[PDB]
Structure formats: structure tokens, C-alpha cells
Amino acid sequence: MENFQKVEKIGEGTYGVVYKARNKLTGEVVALKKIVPSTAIREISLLKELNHPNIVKLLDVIHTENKLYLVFEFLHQDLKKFMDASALTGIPLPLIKSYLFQLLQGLAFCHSHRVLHRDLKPQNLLINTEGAIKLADFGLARAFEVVTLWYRAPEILLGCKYYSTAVDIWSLGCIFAEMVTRRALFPGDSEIDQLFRIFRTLGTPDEVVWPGVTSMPDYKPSFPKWARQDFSKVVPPLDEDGRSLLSQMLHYDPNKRISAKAALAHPFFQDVTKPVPHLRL
Template sequence: MLTVSSDTLSQNANKLDKFIKLRKAGEGTYGVVYKAKDKITGKFVALKKMKLDRYENRDSEGIPSTAIREICLLKDLHHSSIVELLDIICGDQKSIYLIFEYLELDLKNYLDLSKERLPEDLIKSYVKQLFEGLAYLHSHRILHRDLKPQNILIDKEGHIKLADFGLSRCFMVPIRAYTHEVVTLWYRAPELLLGSKMYGPGVDVWSLACIMAEMITKKAIFTGDSEIDQVYKMFKICGTPNESTWPGCTSLPDYRSSFPKWEPQDLSDHIDFHTPQQKDFLLSILEYNPAKRFTAREALKTDYLKHTKLTSPELQSFEGFSQN
């Protein structure tokens, strides 16, 4: 049974009084996020109010196991590319407040607000930081399982961080069965789309590959409006997988012999790459076969990311956002 110590969950609801809520910064299935200010330090924080009555398997009293799982994961994560959990405060019986470090924008907002194409050095800087965070997660046997631009935060100095661990799970070796109904559709790995319940860190790498493609083009590469449409959008560009390109794929629960047989297209027909090296790197992580797909650590060892430096984003987008 999952438990959280009294040191971790403060019973003093008055601790909330030290924060001034400035505006709503976002809202998800299980909570609302506010930009807030610490009255004592003057620092901005992100205050996430978790609505416990929205969680499944909740007892009439106490904290549901799904909420505890997320908190337990977050409180043990300490990495420069992962948003930091600063404090946990119990509100009333229906809510818990998670206090996070504050970053100005999520990646989706930044891509929408940016007027110009993102330069390659910024993309490389972002991709390297994200893979560093992912390598840290995977080394601690944690799958994020919901990587998308909305769950990635950035600041004015060029830092980028993984956030929103509501669907994250610990994994063991050998991999055991998990639900395949995770990850937002446009960023869902092919093994998940084809119904595999035995999957590993590669699902996060595929999501990050889709995010990298979106950084280059400023639009999502696979935009299905249903699971089968997502599969077809993916197959039309990357080709319909078979036993020679992805051994074992035809045995996956949702693979159909009736799938149309598309040949893989040149990715350059869909993405205007900055350099051939950028294309080669993306192909190594946008790989159907999870066994051949680069791991986060392998991606970090490539020449493409090896000498990448921190790069600041276009500040005009931040200024436009702060005025909203």
C-alpha cells in the first residue's frame, strides 16, 4: 500500500496563505495550475491544485493511490531538465496543492507564438536537454508516458523541462504488461497504437521524436483524429510496417493484414530539415521497431547532440505571452 509520510504532506492548510494567486496558467483532467507568487521570497511558483474527487479508486476519506503515486514519483526526481516539486500542501479533503518551480511558457505556446522558424541551434539545445531528462527518468525506471509540447516547459534563458507526470509509471525488467491507452494520440508510439501491452522506454523516445519534428515544422507530423486515422497518417509517411522492417509487428493485437500497404516516403518531403545530420538523427528516433529505436542515452552520444550548448529562445514570444 502506498503511503506518504507526515513530513511530505503538510497538514497545515495555512501554508497556502504565503502564496498570492496571480492567474490561471492551465487546467487538466485532475487539476488547475495557477501562476502564484511567494509573499516571503517574491519568487514565482506554479501552484497545481489536484482535485482528488476526479481520481478513480478513491476511498471516502484519504488520498487516492493514483494521486500518491504521482507525488511519490515527483518528490524523488531531481534533475535540471525536470520541473522541480518544491512543496506539497494539503488543502481540504478534496484537494492537494503541489508547488512547482515556475517557467514562463509551455513548448506548445512558444511554437504558436514564435513568428519565425526555430533555429537549429535552439532545437538541438532543447532536444539535448529533453533527452538528458528522459535518460535520467529511464535510469530510475520511470516512464513518462505523456510527452507532448503542452507538458514541456521553457524559460527565457533557454532551459526546457519535462512536466506533468500524471500518467508516469515505474517499470521493471523484464517489462510487464501495462495499458496501451496512454500518451496523447499524436505522440503515441506505433507499438502502443497497435495494442502492445509490453512496452518500455522507447514509447517516450518516439514521443520526443514527434516533438522534435514539430519544433522544426511548427506543426505536428502525425495528426490523426482517431486511433486508426493516426495509424494511417503514420503509415502513409513512414510506410506500412511488416516482418522484415519490424519483426513481430504482425503479431501485435491491433495489427491487421488488411492494412493498406504504403511505401515509406522521403522524410524531407514533409520536413524542411536544417541539415542532413538533423534528418539522420530524427530517423534514428522515429524508428518503428522499438529494439532498433535509439535509447535516450544512445541519442545523447550521437555527434549531432554531443557539442550542443544552451541557447536562448526568441524573447518576443515571451513578451507577447506575458501581456495576455
């Protein structure tokens, strides 16, 4: 730690405390995350390689005195605070669209290298004054105070052990709908409550929409059978392009669910721009 001065506690991460810190030598301000098996060492080292404009840059990995610290480029806000701050009027749609597009870019990159996030949520989406948004804590999940289930894909909730990059698309779809409506899509407060909120909005899945569902580990023939709601009721006043895209990001069957790369080609992004957010630091 010596080479750093903790300027302040930024928050209580999943894997430990987060500090804003200044490199006593380089002068650079940074995010310092306190988290040791060699596997965790090997995973995090891979992470140093996947550099992308929409991934929070992992500056350094300090394994000293059998402790683990990750050093990340610092950004001044996350999407959760910005949403609360924009509750009154909502985030403008052009900004929502730009955030969605850049996030999809980040995902398409990670996914092309077979790296999933697994835990997307507005808290780990960081933004700057220049209109950029970045995925934070990418890959930390494989490598390793209630954790939110609100963005969890249903195949995870159903006990699927070998899930795909589709889980991140699902989470990002949930975040998309939340930006638009200013309300969490599926605010579950247990794994069953989470699952059943999903069922209530999208319909109880069956073998028609999701072949193999009924054979999943935690699936029960006894689940109530709810009817799917219509999306126009779910995310007004998102336009038809947005709704089409959202519906594809929220497909039950992970194999039907749109990829990040395919989502980038959707006509919703036909008119994408890069607006600057007004944020007060």
C-alpha cells in the same frame, strides 16, 4: 490551499486546473496543480526525488482535506506557445538542437530511474529566459477537452500494455520534426487517423521492420499497405545528421528505437550550444 494566493489560471491541465500562485509565507511564485488512493500518493512521492535541471521541480505535495495539489517551480512559457510565436521565421536550428539535447538529458535521467513520461507534447515542455527547457508532468501518468494523440508512439496505438521508455523517444522525435518544419508531424484526430498518418509517412509496419507487430492486440491484417516516404521529403531542410537522428528516434520497433543516452552521443550534437531565446513575457 490557505498558504497560497491564486494569482491566475495558467490553464486546464490533464489532471485538473493549473494556477500561477504565490506562497503567502515564502513569497515564492509557483505553479499550483489541482488533481485519493495511497498508490497515487506513493507514486507522486517518488517524483519528489527525481530532481534534474531539465525536469520541472516538484516543490511540494499537499494532501489536505482529501484533495491533491502539486506545487511546481514556475516557468513563464511552454514550447507550444513559443512555436506559435516563432511560426513566421521558425526556431533557429541552434536553439532547436539545444532544446532537443536538454530534453534528451532529462529523459536519460528519468529513464535511468525507470520513470517514463508517457505523454510528451509541446504543451508540457517549459522554457525560461536563460535558454533552458524542462519536462513538466513527468510520472504523473503512471500515478493516474480532447487529449492529443499526435505524439503517441505506435506500440501504444496498437494496444501494447507494457510499453517502455521508447515511447518518450518517439514523442520527442515528433516534437523535433515539428520544431524544424513548423507543422505537426502526425496530427491525428482519432486513434485510427493517428495510426494511419504514421503508416502513410513511415510505411505500414510489417514483420520485416517490426518483428511481432502483426501479433499486437489492435493490429489488423486489413490495414492498408502504404509505402514509406523518404525523410528528405518529411523534414526539409534538416541536415543529414538531424535526419539520421530523427529516423532512429522514429523506429517502429521500440527495441530498435534509439535510447535517450545513445541519442546524446549522436554526431548531430557535435556542435551543440546553449542559445538564449528571445521571448516576450
